[PDB]
């Protein structure tokens, strides 16, 4: 039979979930949906005809989805995942999996303890552009890696923060790093390797929010590479750049675009057949741009059919969450913060 | 009459100075050359017909240049400049002006006290590209500046350091930040304003030298902007980039190329005449690539001729020298180092 | 200018315990060098030394420099005088051969070096073990990349110095004059860290005076990290029961393993490399050689000094060479005193 998914939180990103599932809606279906907001609740059942619950506990008491998708305010992810795990179901959390390190740790434990799956959505990893780099690195083509820089120079006006009380709060959301660039902070670990320590500066330069809208982290990996990630939601007058550059002994790559959609530099000491898949990898990522979930849910659904291991499990999500925390302790504390965290 | 320059150090950069003085042949001439190495003193003689000395002290007992140009190993610059000033002549010091903060302050006090002028060579400040950026920043066209990123991704092979013992040594050179990237570190204070603090990592990842071939500094300006400068001489397989990117409230500029020589992104809320100077700045800055000494001399000569004041006098050199020093202290000590220095 | 047309004239300052190896090393090159002068503050050691040498005696360094003509002065005094003696020697315009270590304080060692630089004189620092045949072979393999990436380095100085050693002279075991186990005895071994393996990034040290009645440490340990990433330690005590047990270095890498044991890095014990080299056959011979000049190492060091002074060479261990180990000792002594990692290079 089909995987029964239920969706908690019917908001802005909910549609890509409904979208990705329905796109597989022959190895799975969307059976229930949940939101504490009458209107958005209405709207979503109106849109899918799954059974509407106006809170998670009612949905868990009565529904029977094999797996709940958390698309609520991020700070509620860990508590929801724990309740969902207590009711004995699998968990797909949107990113970031938590706004606090200890909550992130508890979610993973709770899921371990209940013997249920915990997936964290990191769809950007399935960019064709990014996949090429990943394989490049995996096969040793860079040889020793030396310098890595990530820019996220995007835009978010006051209105965007004002559309929802939770937005920009430490407890629910985090700032530009935890929310918008968490996808890029993820590359750091996933693509180049384990990070040894970071130092960061952040501030709230212009928006009325609690968290940061701007920041920098210098980074040092365990194998010794160094680098920065540089992030603002204040760019004028719109998204300028979402990029990663990686320089090594025998390889140089830059993945440009507004979202790591365009490989601008690709140079290597020795040839490999991927040298010729560049223009069209730029092709597939740019046309899936903003719609990586379908591909995400194909690994979910394969892992649940006992076919695969999850590509992004709770522990994987902890990698990026540890880094954000490091960056946030560094900025608040004015001190280098090393990994892994206690 | 023509201004009379002496050159101290007839090594690799000597030709560009020779080049540039001859190019103001009617306002000045190279009268004296000096190198402690018989062989390149000879050839610098053959090629200019100026009068050769074999030590600076003899050139100063016997010669009469109004201005001596120090193109020796950087660690020698402060000690030569003190001797020169002591002998009542003007100092043109190649970059960087010193390798130790204290030596730099000392060379400044001696030029002050002797009544001599002290110029530090930062030719890049003359780039037509950066002059437009400077002017937009001074006219306030960016509004509040928020994020600044600078990359120096260049290539020096081991055979480049192997050419002269002085190279890559802490005493005489410093590493990739203090030698090659100082023109870029120079930009942080010159264009964007006083820096408040830095945190840096550096390392010798590949070259056989004392100092770093690779590094990153995270930075916070007094006005609140944050940024980073990322540097490496290990780029594959040759120079990739020398770039500055500045994002403010109503402005977004990026100067790309291998050497801040092509304005790549230029966007502003309100228009201004210079908007139309851009293709010109790019052609002119790129066309003088490898050769901006001519332009630097113009000001040097305009100033000795009692016209202007120095674009880059000794305290100006002190500005990047202080940042370079905070970067090195921070990288060595693993802490944020704040300015101004003791 | 080089001294090419007449034997080098050396002067010896300090006629105490090690002076006898200098006097005899110099005499072992009687054809290129001679000892013409000797200076001691102690009427009687000077007495012994003149009768012993037939050199001209002087009872203070000022006098020896005012009336003497030596081309180079050898500094064989308590370690904390070397800086100040080297600066006055240099102001009178002659070369300086300073005994190890070149000073006991970082700033004094910098000032020694600057002074010689601005006098245009040579400053050599005695580091005889560098000429050891065993350590030369290791140096050669490290220099031709035979170890690959170096990972782990350990150095042991497990030696014996009884209280009566320290009491023999008042200056011994004092911070100002001597320093402790690290700065006096194991400095030849601290020297190997940078000389052999490469630039040190930082150290953490514990030291203590566990038994001797002296000021400085008689026992300690330093943890190390190198800039290229290897780690290791240096383990030092002058309290070994009942006499010297070990003076050793072990270097471990991707394709090389080397251990130099003995009481004084005089006997290569382990030696394994991924790819063969003629030097592989030179080991037993190098052991026998280094062992055979155990205690009499100076003759070899002076070969190089004389060459350098004759214009043949650059010195193997000049002033800056000598600052490299002074800087580690300083870092090790500041780390022990303050309880924090001390990174290099020093301000
Ligand atoms: N992977 C990705 O590309 C993206 C991930 N996200 C993440 O997904 C989550 C999406 O947030 P958005 O859709 O963008 O903001 P949102 O405000 O549009 O979503 C709001 C929905 O959740 C509801 N909600 C609030 N409290 C609830 C509760 N206790 N129970 C159930 N529903 C509750 C809101 O009333 C509304 O129904 C966030 O964690 C965000 O980081 C968001 C966009 C993209
Ligand atoms: N502004 C710019 O674009 C550039 C600046 N530089 C800077 O210029 C200086 C020169 O660098 P290079 O030309 O690359 O290296 P270099 O090694 O090629 O030039 C060295 C010359 O100085 C001589 N020398 C050494 N000691 C001396 C002394 N006491 N007196 C007189 N001569 C002495 C050497 O024998 C040699 O011929 C450094 O400060 C370097 O950073 C270098 C290239 C470009
Ligand atoms: N390279 C090596 O293997 C060895 C190096 N050394 C070093 O060489 C120096 C030798 O110390 P030792 O001979 O063992 O101790 P020491 O006490 O035996 O010799 C000291 C001599 O210096 C004389 N002296 C003291 N003050 C003087 C002054 N102001 N001017 C001239 N002479 C003065 C003393 O009167 C005494 O005769 C020390 O730095 C020691 O670390 C010592 C033994 C071996
Ligand atoms: C994969 C990925 O990057 N996901 C992140 C990403 O998603 P998504 O791509 O959907 O953002 P979307 O581009 O729609 O712009 C959002 C608003 O910005 C405003 N916005 C946007 C762009 C711009 O140029 N100007 C602008 O005002 C405009 O108001 C837009 O409505 O932005 C999400 C977010 O910020 O909440 C993050 O939660 C995600 O993790
Ligand atoms: C304006 C400016 O950037 N000045 C700095 C700059 O000057 P200059 O303009 O001469 O650089 P130039 O590029 O010609 O090659 C230098 C060597 O690099 C090697 N080099 C260079 C590029 C490359 O791709 N590969 C390479 O090997 C090449 O073989 C060359 O021999 O480089 C100097 C330096 O590093 O010593 C710095 O001191 C200056 O501050
Ligand atoms: C090359 C080298 O290691 N140099 C260092 C070395 O020199 P040198 O070879 O002369 O030492 P020497 O072996 O004679 O023992 C010295 C006394 O130790 C006592 N000693 C020695 C061995 C032992 O087992 N027991 C013992 O009591 C016994 O009293 C010895 O008389 O020891 C010098 C010192 O300590 O002042 C250091 O300054 C040198 O830098």
Three-state helix/strand/coil letters over A71-97: CCCHHHHHHHHHHHHHCCCEEEECCCC
Q: Tally C-beta pairs within 8 A across B and C.
A: 13
- Are B99 and B154 contacting, i.e. CB atoms less than 8 angstroms apart? no
- In angstroms, the Cα distances linking B221 to A6, A209, B250, B338 are 48, 21, 18, 10
C281 in a structural domain: no
Distance between CA atoms of A277 and B120, rounded to whole angstroms?
Answer: 49
Ligand 6 atom nearest to C164, measured from its CA: 29
Q: Do both A17 and A118 map to the same domain?
A: yes
Experiment used for this model: X-ray
List the one residue out of B36, B289, B247, B275 whose CA is nearest residue B144: B247
Question: Which CATH number fits the domain that encloses residue A303?
Answer: 3.40.50.720
- Are C65 and C88 contacting, i.e. CB atoms less than 8 angstroms apart? yes
Dihedral-angle region of residue B156 (phi above 0 means left; psi in -120 to 50 means alpha; beta otherwise) = beta
- Are A119 and A95 contacting, i.e. CB atoms less than 8 angstroms apart? no
Cβ neighbours of A331 in B, within 8 Å: none
H/E/C letters for each residue in chain A? CCEEEEEECCCCCHHHHHHHHHCCCCCEEEEEEECCCHHHHHHHHHHHCCEEECCHHHHHHHCCCCEEEECCCHHHHHHHHHHHHHCCCEEEECCCCCCCHHHHHHHHHHHHHCCCCEEECCHHHHCHHHHHHHHHHHCCCCCCEEEEEEEEECECCHHHHHCCCCCCCCCCCCCCCCCCCHHHHHHHHHHHCCEEEEEEEEECCCCCCCCCCEEEEEEEECCCCEEEEEEECECCCCCCEEEEEEEECCEEEEEECCCCCEEEEEEECCCCHHHHCHHHHHHHHHHHCCCCHHHHHHHHHHHHCCCCCCCCEHHHHHHHHHHHHHHHHHHHHCCCEECCCC
- Are C299 and C25 contacting, i.e. CB atoms less than 8 angstroms apart? yes
* Bridge partners for C125 per DSSP: C98
C109 in a structural domain: yes
Facing B332 at nearest CB: one of C199, C320, C343: C343
User: What is the Cα Rg of chain B in Å?
Assistant: 20
> Residue A307 — φ and ψ, nearest 5°?
-85, -45
Q: Does B238 touch chain A (CB under 8 A)?
A: no
**Residues 6+ away with beta carbon under 8 Å from B238:** B155
Q: Do both C202 and C342 map to the same domain?
A: yes
Q: Do both A27 and A42 map to the same domain?
A: yes
Question: At B101, is the secondary structure helix, strand, or coil?
Answer: helix
* Bridge partners for C273 per DSSP: C256
CB burial string C105-144: b at 16+ within 10 A, e below: bbebbbbbbebbeebebbbbbbbbbbbbbbbebbeebbee
Question: Which CATH number fits the domain that encloses residue A342?
Answer: 3.30.360.10
Q: Report the DSSP pairing between strands A226-232 and A145-153.
A: parallel
Q: Report the DSSP pairing between strands A251-256 and A195-203.
A: unpaired
**Residues 6+ away with beta carbon under 8 Å from C195:** C127, C130, C139, C321, C324, C325
In the numeric block, which tokens belong to residue B215?
């590094």
What chain A residue is nearest to B200 in terms of C-alpha separation?
A218
Number of domains in chain A: 2
Distance between CA atoms of B314 and C214, rounded to whole angstroms?
Answer: 50
Question: At B181, is the secondary structure helix, strand, or coil?
Answer: coil
Q: What angle do CA C210, C213, C214 make, to 5 degrees?
A: 95
C219 in a structural domain: yes
Q: What angle do CA A157, A159, A163 make, to 5 degrees?
A: 135
Residue owning tokens 């190997």: C192
- Are C61 and C94 contacting, i.e. CB atoms less than 8 angstroms apart? no
- In angstroms, the Cα distances linking B34 to B65, B68, B107 are 12, 10, 20
The secondary structure of B187-251 as a DSSP string is: HIIIII--EEEEEEEEE--SSSSSS-SEEEEEEEETTS-EEEEEEESB-SSS--EEEEEEEETTE
Question: At C166, is the secondary structure helix, strand, or coil?
Answer: helix
Question: At B305, is the secondary structure helix, strand, or coil?
Answer: coil
Distance between CA atoms of B241 and B231, rounded to whole angstroms?
Answer: 10
Question: At C26, is the secondary structure helix, strand, or coil?
Answer: helix
The shortest C-alpha distance from B207 to chain C (Å) reads 10
Q: Does B243 touch chain A (CB under 8 A)?
A: no
Q: Do both B187 and B334 map to the same domain?
A: yes
Q: Do both C82 and C191 map to the same domain?
A: no
Say if ligand 1 is within 6 A of residue A56 CB: yes
Say if ligand 5 is within 6 A of residue B105 CB: no
CA-nearest residue for atom 44, ligand 1, is A13
Q: What is the separation of C-alpha B156 from the centre of its chain, rounded to a whole number of angstroms?
A: 18
Distance between CA atoms of A209 and A211, rounded to whole angstroms?
Answer: 6
B225 in a structural domain: yes
Distance between CA atoms of C185 and B138, rounded to whole angstroms?
Answer: 62
Question: At B144, is the secondary structure helix, strand, or coil?
Answer: coil
Total Cβ atoms within 10 A of residue A329: 17
* Bridge partners for C154 per DSSP: C233, C250
Q: Which of A228, A329, A334 would you mutate first to test chain B, the one with the most B CBs within 10 A?
A: A228
A136 in a structural domain: yes
Question: At C256, is the secondary structure helix, strand, or coil?
Answer: strand
- Which ligand is in closest contact with the Cα of C290? 6
Q: Report the DSSP pairing between strands C231-237 and C123-125.
A: unpaired
Q: Report the DSSP pairing between strands A90-93 and C123-125.
A: unpaired
List the one residue out of B1, B2, B5, B14 whose CA is nearest residue B117: B5
C66 in a structural domain: yes
Cβ neighbours of C320 in B, within 8 Å: 171
Q: Does B151 touch chain A (CB under 8 A)?
A: yes
Number of H helices, E strands in chain B: 11, 14
Distance between CA atoms of C195 and C190, rounded to whole angstroms?
Answer: 9
The secondary structure of B104-132 as a DSSP string is: HHHHHHHHHHHT--EEE--GGGG-HHHHH
Q: Do both A209 and A319 map to the same domain?
A: yes
Which of A70, A93, A160 most suits a substitution to test ligand 4, by most atoms within 8 Å of the C-beta? A160
In the numeric block, which tokens belong to residue B124?
């890049």
Distance between CA atoms of C283 and B82, rounded to whole angstroms?
Answer: 53
Q: Give C273-279 contacts, CB < 8 A, sequence gap 24+.
A: C273/C141, C273/C146, C273/C147, C274/C148, C275/C146, C277/C141, C277/C144, C277/C146, C279/C137, C279/C140, C279/C141
Structural domain span for residue C92: 1-134+293-318
**Sheet of B262-268, strands arranged across:** B262-268, B251-256, B241-248, B145-153, B226-232, B214-221, B195-203, B337-338
- Are B254 and B130 contacting, i.e. CB atoms less than 8 angstroms apart? no
Which residues between 255 and 294 in chain A have a beta carbon less than 8 angstroms from any beta carbon of chain B? 265, 267-269
Q: Do both C143 and C180 map to the same domain?
A: yes
Number of H helices, E strands in chain C: 11, 14
List the one residue out of B240, B213, B301 whose CA is nearest residue B29: B301
List the one residue out of C321, C29, C265 whose CA is nearest residue C136: C265
Total Cβ atoms within 10 A of residue A165: 10
Distance between CA atoms of B226 and B223, rounded to whole angstroms?
Answer: 9
Cβ neighbours of A201 in B, within 8 Å: 199, 218-220, 226
Cβ neighbours of C228 in B, within 8 Å: 204
Q: Prior bond to A95 cis, omega within 30?
A: no
Q: Do both B321 and B187 map to the same domain?
A: yes
Question: At C207, is the secondary structure helix, strand, or coil?
Answer: strand
> Residue C75 — φ and ψ, nearest 5°?
-105, 110
C177 in a structural domain: yes
Q: What is the separation of C-alpha A192 from the centre of its chain, rounded to a whole number of angstroms?
A: 17
Q: Do both B341 and B206 map to the same domain?
A: yes
C271 in a structural domain: no
Q: Do both C334 and C312 map to the same domain?
A: no
Binding-site sequence positions of C for NADH? 15, 17-18, 40-41, 77, 79, 82, 99-100, 128, 171-172, 188
Q: Does B170 touch chain C (CB under 8 A)?
A: yes
Distance between CA atoms of B63 and B21, rounded to whole angstroms?
Answer: 18
Q: How far is the CA of B118 from the centre of ligand 1 (A)?
A: 61
Q: Report the DSSP pairing between strands C33-39 and C8-13.
A: parallel
Distance between CA atoms of C164 and B218, rounded to whole angstroms?
Answer: 56
Q: Do both A55 and A176 map to the same domain?
A: no
User: In Å, what resolution does this model reach?
Assistant: 2.1
Q: Do both B99 and B205 map to the same domain?
A: no
Q: Report the DSSP pairing between strands C246-253 and C200-208.
A: unpaired
């Amino acid at each position: 039979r089909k995987i029964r998914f239920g969706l908690v939180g019917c908001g802005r990103i909910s549609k890509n979930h409904i979208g990705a599932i329905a796109q597989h809606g022959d190895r799975a279906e969307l059976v229930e949906i949940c939101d504490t907001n009458p209107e958005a609740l209405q709207a979503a059942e109106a849109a899918t005809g799954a059974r509407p619950f106006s809170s998670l506990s009612d949905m868990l008491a009565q529904g029977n989805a094999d797996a709940l998708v958390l698309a609520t305010p991020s700070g509620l992810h860990p508590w929801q995942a724990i309740e969902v795990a207590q009711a004995g179901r699998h968990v797909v959390s949107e990113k970031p999996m938590a706004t606090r390190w200890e909550d992130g740790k508890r979610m993973v434990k709770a899921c371990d303890e209940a013997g249920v799956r915990l997936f964290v959505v990191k769809q950007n990893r399935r960019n064709a552009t990014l996949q090429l780099v990943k394989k490049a690195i995996e096969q040793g083509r860079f040889g020793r890696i030396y310098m890595v820089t990530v820019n996220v120079f995007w835009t978010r006006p006051q209105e965007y923060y004002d559309a929802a009380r939770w937005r920009g709060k430490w407890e629910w959301d985090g700032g530009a790093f935890m929310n918008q660039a968490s996808h890029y902070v993820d590359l750091l670990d996933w693509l180049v390797g384990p990070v040894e320590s970071v130092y960061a500066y952040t501030a709230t330069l212009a928006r009325r929010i609690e968290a940061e809208d701007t920041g920098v982290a210098a980074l040092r990996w365990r194998h010794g590479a160094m680098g920065s990630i540089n992030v603002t939601m204040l760019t004028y007058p719109q998204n300028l750049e979402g990029s990663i550059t990686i320089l090594g002994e025998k390889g140089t790559v830059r993945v440009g675009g507004v979202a790591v959609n365009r490989i601008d530099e690709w140079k290597f000491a020795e040839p490999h057949p991927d040298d010729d898949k560049i223009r069209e990898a730029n092709y597939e990522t740019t046309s899936v741009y903003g719609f990586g979930h379908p591909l995400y849910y194909d690994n979910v659904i394969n892992c649940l059919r006992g076919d695969c291991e999850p590509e992004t499990d709770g522990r994987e999500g902890l990698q990026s969450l540890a880094l954000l925390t490091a960056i946030y302790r560094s900025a608040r504390d004015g001190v280098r913060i090393p990994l892994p965290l206690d």
